[PDB]
Design a protein around this ligand. Structure first.
Ligand SMILES: C[C@]12CC[C@H]3[C@@H](CCC4=CC(=O)CC[C@@]43C)[C@@H]1CC[C@@H]2O
Ligand SMILES: Oc1ccc(C2Nc3cccc4cccc(c34)N2)cc1O
Length: 249
């Protein structure tokens, strides 16, 4: 249970958005708080990524790259898990102080993306995802998006990712008998994981589009979000960096 003990030990606690719930729900106010929340969650993502088994064996530029590419997917997934465990997926639980009901979903102007996020959230319920399956899936999301012409040390990346797939396959296969059950299950979970990607990508277009018009629309982006969204996110939009799918889309 060593790999699982570590994944349960390094898991972030609650991150607050710092949203002032006494302000009226406006676009400016909702998206600036989401942006601050993304910025706060980045600090914790960085510290979590670095405590992961084998992570520091990656080349150091590569460690920065996988995090600056995959943060959107990791946070969407974790948020869907929080929504599921806290409000049985009925609303989007970004943070204790920034929970979206239907009105916030409309005012944020991301209503259809929110719907797709609630759908992802509900799959945790429909699939009866266990906390152990959750933590191994989210660890893998870290290794699920890279540049098309490879990382600085692609071989070390490939080995690591292989090992994360094997740990997920093992977290399933601890507790099952005569096995159509075990294939069907791995199939289900690799389908859930592939499904995070098109969602992440919608939110990549959205937040890029917003950063560009952010002065016209009084939305604040803090230091790191603004930098990652202008430097790394367009490499995803332009197709220089692409998700690693299990099944072909
Ligand atoms: C990227 C973004 C700010 C950060 C958001 C993102 C939507 C999903 C998301 C979920 C979280 O739980 C952390 C914040 C993030 C990562 C927002 C959509 C537009 C906005 O600019
Ligand atoms: O080897 C390393 C790999 C990634 C990082 C790392 N990656 C980051 C991405 C985005 C924002 C950051 C802000 C502060 C520190 C970081 C960031 N640190 C630091 C390292 O020293």
């Amino acid at each position: 249970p060593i790999f699982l003990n570590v994944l349960e030990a390094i898991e972030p606690g609650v991150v607050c958005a710092g949203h002032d719930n006494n302000q009226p729900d406006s676009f400016a106010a909702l998206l600036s708080s989401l942006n601050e929340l993304g910025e706060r969650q980045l600090v914790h993502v960085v510290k979590w990524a670095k405590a992961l088994p084998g992570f520091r064996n990656l080349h150091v530029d590569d460690q920065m790259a996988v995090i600056q590419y995959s943060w959107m997917g990791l946070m969407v997934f974790a948020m869907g898990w929080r929504s599921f465990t806290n409000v049985n997926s009925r609303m989007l639980y970004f943070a204790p102080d920034l929970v979206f009901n239907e009105y916030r979903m409309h005012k944020s102007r991301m209503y259809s993306q929110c719907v797709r996020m609630r759908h992802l959230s509900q799959e945790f319920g429909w699939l009866q995802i266990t906390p152990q399956e959750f933590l191994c899936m989210k660890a893998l999301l870290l290794f699920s998006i890279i540049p098309v012409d490879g990382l600085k040390n692609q071989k070390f990346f490939d080995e690591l990712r292989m090992n994360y797939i094997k740990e997920l396959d093992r977290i399933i296969a601890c507790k099952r008998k005569n096995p159509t059950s075990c294939s069907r299950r791995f199939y289900q979970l690799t389908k859930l994981l592939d499904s995070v990607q098109p969602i992440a990508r919608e939110l990549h277009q959205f937040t890029f589009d917003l950063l560009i018009k952010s002065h016209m629309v009084s939305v604040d982006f803090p230091e790191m979000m603004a930098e990652i969204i202008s430097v790394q996110v367009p490499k995803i939009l332009s197709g220089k960096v692409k998700p690693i799918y299990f099944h072909t889309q």
